[PDB]
Design a protein around this ligand. Sequence first.
Ligand code: MCN
Ligand code: MCN
Ligand code: FES
Ligand code: FES
Ligand code: FES
Ligand code: FES
Ligand code: MO
Ligand code: MO
Lengths: 770, 765, 160, 160
Amino acid sequence: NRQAWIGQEVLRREDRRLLTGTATFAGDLGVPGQLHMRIVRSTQAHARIVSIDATEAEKTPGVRMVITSEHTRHLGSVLLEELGYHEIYENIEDFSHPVLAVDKVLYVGQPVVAVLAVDPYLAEDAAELVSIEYEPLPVLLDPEEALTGKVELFPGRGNEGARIKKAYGDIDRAFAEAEHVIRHKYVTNRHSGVPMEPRAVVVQPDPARDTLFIWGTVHVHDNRRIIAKMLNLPEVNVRMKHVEIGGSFGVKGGVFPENVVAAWAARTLGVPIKWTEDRVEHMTSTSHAREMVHKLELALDAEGRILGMKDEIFHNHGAYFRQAEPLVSDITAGIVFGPYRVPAYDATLHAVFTNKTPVGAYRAPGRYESTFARERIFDLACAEIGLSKTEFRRRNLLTAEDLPWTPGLDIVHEPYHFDSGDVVKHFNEALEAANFSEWLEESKRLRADGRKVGVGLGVLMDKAGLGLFETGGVEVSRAGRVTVKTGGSSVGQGIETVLAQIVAEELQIAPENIDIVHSDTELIPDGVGSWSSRSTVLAGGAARKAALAVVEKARRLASEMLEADPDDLELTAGSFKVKGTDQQISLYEIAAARDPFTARADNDEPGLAADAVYMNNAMNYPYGVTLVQIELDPDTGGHRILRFSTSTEAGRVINPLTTRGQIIGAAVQGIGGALYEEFLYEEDGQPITTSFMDYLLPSAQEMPNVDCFVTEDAKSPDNPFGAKGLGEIGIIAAGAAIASAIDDAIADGVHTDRLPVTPEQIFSRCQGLN
Amino acid sequence: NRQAWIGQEVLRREDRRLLTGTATFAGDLGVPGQLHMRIVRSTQAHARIVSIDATEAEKTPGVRMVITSEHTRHLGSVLLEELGYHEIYENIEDFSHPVLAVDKVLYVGQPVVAVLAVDPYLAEDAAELVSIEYEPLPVLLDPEEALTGKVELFPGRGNEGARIKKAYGDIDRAFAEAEHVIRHKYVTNRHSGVPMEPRAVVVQPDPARDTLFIWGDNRRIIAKMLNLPEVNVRMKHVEIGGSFGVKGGVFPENVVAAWAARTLGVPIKWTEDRVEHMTSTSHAREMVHKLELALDAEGRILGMKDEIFHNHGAYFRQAEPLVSDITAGIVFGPYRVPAYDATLHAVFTNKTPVGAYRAPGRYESTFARERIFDLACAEIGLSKTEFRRRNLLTAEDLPWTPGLDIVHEPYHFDSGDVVKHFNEALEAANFSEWLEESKRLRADGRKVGVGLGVLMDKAGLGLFETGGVEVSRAGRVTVKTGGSSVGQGIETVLAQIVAEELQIAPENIDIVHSDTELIPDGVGSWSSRSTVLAGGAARKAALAVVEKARRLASEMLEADPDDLELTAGSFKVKGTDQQISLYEIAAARDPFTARADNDEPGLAADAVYMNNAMNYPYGVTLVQIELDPDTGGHRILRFSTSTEAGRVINPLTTRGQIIGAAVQGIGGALYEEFLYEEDGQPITTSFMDYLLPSAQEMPNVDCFVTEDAKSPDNPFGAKGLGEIGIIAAGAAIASAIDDAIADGVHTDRLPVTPEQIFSRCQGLN
Amino acid sequence: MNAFRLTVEVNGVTHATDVEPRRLLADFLRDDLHLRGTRVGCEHGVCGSCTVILDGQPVRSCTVLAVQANNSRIETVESLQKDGQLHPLQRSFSKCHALQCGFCTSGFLMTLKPLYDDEDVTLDATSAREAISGNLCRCTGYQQIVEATVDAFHCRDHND
Amino acid sequence: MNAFRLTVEVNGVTHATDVEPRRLLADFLRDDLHLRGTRVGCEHGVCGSCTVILDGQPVRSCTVLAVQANNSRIETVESLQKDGQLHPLQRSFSKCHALQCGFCTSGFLMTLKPLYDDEDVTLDATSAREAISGNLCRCTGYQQIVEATVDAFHCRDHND
Ligand SMILES: Nc1ccn([C@@H]2O[C@H](COP(=O)(O)OP(=O)(O)OC[C@H]3Oc4nc5nc(N)nc(O)c5nc4C(S)=C3S)[C@@H](O)[C@H]2O)c(=O)n1
Ligand SMILES: Nc1ccn([C@@H]2O[C@H](COP(=O)(O)OP(=O)(O)OC[C@H]3Oc4nc5nc(N)nc(O)c5nc4C(S)=C3S)[C@@H](O)[C@H]2O)c(=O)n1
Ligand code: FES
Ligand code: FES
Ligand code: FES
Ligand code: FES
Ligand SMILES: [Mo]
Ligand SMILES: [Mo]
């Protein structure tokens, strides 16, 4: 019996917690003697202040204290972000406010003053009574007029952002010797993750001062490292506790001003502090994303093959870096080329500042915005060259042949180098088999008195190792069960299930008996976290050589327990059959026997100096094509997405049932970005989309009756097991394909630039009939 | 250079927590949604039952549930003792409740039924309304009557304990080959610790497919009984206010809480009533000693002998019968003892189950000996003092691997007295003695007495004790230990040990313990153990970090070198031109490919472990009482206990332990006894009946008298000290009293009541 | 100045407690009736999680002051499970991976509950979508939920 | 069964709360006032830890119903330290190692407090013992406590 578990559809381990409601979330936590923090936020977009009136706030009963800026610029550093630095140069700042500075305000929703009261009702009751008089300054909003820079945000100025540049060989000759040279600029919409759980933090101090407990949800819960350094009380003593999270999409990823204010205030009062975000707040305070300006250029010959490709990008970072370091901007500038033959290139990314909510990293950050413009310049190019988008992408995709194809673009640091180590294979048979699966041609064939069709491709910077390591640990027990410690984090995508399978496979124990513990920094003093579709080959790779450390620790230890040497039958139950077929020793009894007999019955080998797990220089790049067909009502602005199918090649799907969730779910978040979601600021500076009535989240009825999934496990990469990151591959080309279809269905020019596609824009067909 | 921390009077670290009110105790803990547990305890010393199901308890609004034996008996099974020797007979029998009885009841105080309410007031409110039907049964109380039929506690075959014997040499031919042979039967008290904090437990479940959080390393049992591991612990740190070995390990209350917290997903809190404590928790001290002693015309020992009956109370908690095994081993103390027969009975009666009170079995045995000695010094007339001077140790004949079945304490293997010379202690520890003698100047002052104490401190313990050292960023070091802070200033002793080896002020060391998530494995703090053990861990770890630094901080700069000047907190290189700090090394090496510290004790082949550590401390106690012949009150005019012990890590806190321990013993000598009426009902249940010593009665005087002689063979050669203060406080007082009448050393039954000091005019007649 | 005494039935257990009028039902059902099962995402009758059974009708625990619920039956997600066995709706939701994060699970489940318990109707993919539409999710999106609900209604009725 | 409205000034801070009459002051001070500094050992005015300053006079917080403290000033061991500094008594208690567990520390310290603050008397070893005698300890043997109190009174008066 060699029961296999990886690749199998097994129902999630997380399911029952969430279904019954036994699972606790950050907002669910209660601690006796709690104080409830409410935050007085900005009402100006750009303003310096004189704030001294919390008098009637301080004097309403039930309120224990009101925290001003002067409390917190103290010690009271300003929000550091970490490695990925060089640095070039420099950093400060942003970081955010970073904590309430008693001088200037750089966006509506910025923390200025925190109150502390007994119940959250009384907390904001006192928050109203706080008065701050403002000097309104001029307001910056357009990324392009940020750097043509009058109206400077920082008085030190403090050039807006960081300028990233990457460019191969001889693009001067690649362009100069081209027949069709194509220039167009694209604009992406400002939108984010907007998960269902708003941000929430609970801090309990151990006033014995020794320590501090944080049931806050800080999204690398092993980034106590920041709070520690900031508060100067490091590094244990800041012991983080595990909580379930209601979705993040990287939008919650990192340290916020709220996190430190609470932690500081908790420490210096010896009193537990609780914080729970407004949705409204979330819309003006939680990290933004997606807003770019994509000037692009192409070099093409009479064949239609690529020769040269690129110009400048303007990433609008909002007002501040927020562990939203060039990281994403650096990634974006690395992969606006995707999985194509691109002889040369010229990135000049301008990460810039405006009076908006500080930009973090939304699901597939910088790659939704880039694979849009890239596929919106390719579609446009087919208009002049004259012939099909299908057979353009078809023969200048990614020659292989070529593979390994060390590019092709830069000067390749994505995010460091060198890459693209595209050792993973056949670029094309995906697109080929993806349309041989099976329609596309079948309703390009349309009697089409309705409307039309679209395409788009997405490669992914999706195992950001991180580099070198990731920790893991497996433990067998006296009670039948198995325990797995990991540096992973259940944002709700099924890590605790995937790892259980990985361990199940290697240990020959049902994934039911295995439990997984994460984000509890007392058990797990070191872990990396969960971002950039990574946690399987990294943390699952940790789980493997952990479970593989026990099998030796056990099988070796079992040969000593009976007297048979390490050869037997073949050895799994999980237990130990020597011979064929006398006797046996179970895997748990082995562990139960290693008690206080001079020892210990467990493993945790990742890692040491010269790390473990080892994933270094080159990450895997998964690639995928999205296929869409839309109908449109022209007398109004309506549309009904008739068909949808994202198909992505990624070696070794670990859990097919759950990966389907990660593909479909993401794809919808893409349609949300493509046709519904935009943060609208009024020309003076105030946010307009603050409620849910304004910001449009896709609902059940409007979505495609099915997103089809075409994944194949050809060409496993060489990081055993040969698997890929898949938690982002849904949204990548969701924007471009929708756009192409809309332009194909009208039909004028293939000339759409700005997302989203509002119903007002989409009667420019009233023009067509006129 | 640099300065020294070890052996220096350093103000302890625990102080500030306790002084200010930041310090958390299990009872101080509150958790939202809490259920307050009140336990309905036994009111019969011995009976079978026909319980109600209230109903009238469960009916009272605010009552969520009532736990009977129905729930807890399936399961977990009976409480589970400990390692792992002693499994040579087969109990249960006992353990304790276990966990709730619906068959027989075996002592007033035994948990029968637990209620669960919203506040603790409604708990006791409804617990009253529970009615239990009883059928009384013949009540056992006397240890001797216990073993000779006719009444039984475990009505099967059991039936009344364990028999522990130890012998070698020829006892009888030594008894035949002797002029003077001495016999007497001594009877000892029933005390316990009775600390100022009563027992308290809080349990928080993570009801989502997970764990339990517990506040109050023997997780191991609860985990097993609930079949909840792999732990899944999760024992959390709380400061404790006095164990004295009374709070021991696992109680019935401990496991009921966990069960109920688990099967409900509701926070459960329990805090003990004082009346409960005096009837529920570890009793001790109750022993009978038959003693035979053989002597030549010179008066040296040729052999000891006879029976001991330990009244274990109703069940086997911890000790198990570790205490009863130990006692039968060291009734001979520090002496030339050629051979003896030592036979011990661990017996049961309808009383609160026995645990390991400070120096368990040592107060008891040390009485019987230094009283069978004063009696030989009466019957041969030879001087009480120089008897011991003639007849303690073998100055030259060391190592002294003892005669009889020894060491076997508790087991494997050896042993013997290699700790320093005995007498020049007794000799040198007589500052003030012989002029304390000059009495009466015919008066009413009367008393002078002596007592002697070996201690199986050490009790390896053992084999190991985990430790760990972390240096990082902000100028502080964090030390994790398997030990427990109970009040002895363990967090300080380690702070010194580490500070010395690390070249950094102890004001910068913080100590973490008893957080089982952080500390996956460890032993506790028992029989005067941890300073050698858990300190030897802290050394081993702090000795590892220095090699991590002074060899991989060699590469951070140039060169190997490798160098002069090892540390002043940092490392000035090859001369006094500048250096890398020790925190700066740690600050550098965290995301860069590795982590910047050490938890070297230990690996698959163990560490730190000081292995069966012998390490026997020793000393004298010197007592001068005044008596008031009618009233029979007394004023201890002078008191001085003596101790030779290894290195003595901290003189200030060691003084506290010694002085503190004595007062507990003096309390046992003249104040404390658990009293019972004929029907088995406990009498001394409040504080007015059980008399703890107070400020006025105790000697303004206690002379610290410690000597650093030959260190043992366990690094920086140290000894266990937290139990030697008490040892002889029994024997010395009694001999002092009998010298104080006089009519000669004929007192047995402790304590010494003033009614007993009504030999007043039975001295005149 | 003004306290109000609630007499409410929640998941069977009746409660009597004094609450200030302005506390919303959602906050009341989480404190101190520690039934964290009900979850709060939006703040104005949109997110869905909010949703609870009030007197048989699904309403938002978030647009109702706790005080308005006096003398009424209330049921939350905690009330589905009956002795270990997950209510079939919960089973098919796991059988079809109808949930990844957890938030949009009280909301949908409680919306679907009275619809389930009443003998009609069938729920086909089209009519299934319309049913759940009152609840938002940012993870699935719905495809599997729609697939999950349907499955639940087949083992319900035609059922071998 | 009808709660009483209590008004008490604790450590300068005023409070207004309904309590049921039967609640002991000790339990009131610990809950919900969340000053765990006051500790409870015996249950009948013996242990000492119990002890608190009531209206300037040290009394047992455990032989007094909370309701009996209405419109009165109460001080606990929490009120000693002012602005990071430990009050002289606490400082000397550490200087002489006058504590080991922690329990018999609120009790003694609060008993000694008004005695300290008032200009008389000296406290010599004999008169020192009689002062603390109202409090029990099972760890120190009082010897060091008696030594600790004396030290506190020398830096107090004859100060250099
Ligand atoms: N059942 C699964 C789950 C994940 N994977 C893949 O294996 C890795 C393990 O996941 P992880 O490393 O956590 O991926 P990320 O750290 O990038 O996070 C998951 C991904 O997809 C997500 N899915 C989410 N789903 C829910 N319900 N809620 C969120 O907040 C989520 N947030 C995210 C975010 S953020 C991203 S970017 C990922 O590469 C993923 O593509 C898989 O093969 N099978
Ligand atoms: N400042 C100190 C403290 C202890 N030691 C010695 O070094 C060892 C470290 O202490 P530990 O290992 O805890 O010794 P025990 O486990 O035997 O506990 C200490 C001892 O003495 C005690 N002292 C106590 N003091 C207080 N205030 N409260 C308790 O509950 C105490 N409980 C005990 C108990 S139990 C005993 S038996 C002990 O052998 C002790 O003798 C030392 O040299 N210097
Ligand atoms: S928050 Fe109340 S309904 Fe969405
Ligand atoms: S809401 Fe995040 S998983 Fe459905
Ligand atoms: S316990 Fe209340 S007075 Fe001692
Ligand atoms: S240390 Fe336990 S009472 Fe003083
Ligand atoms: Mo992400
Ligand atoms: Mo002890």
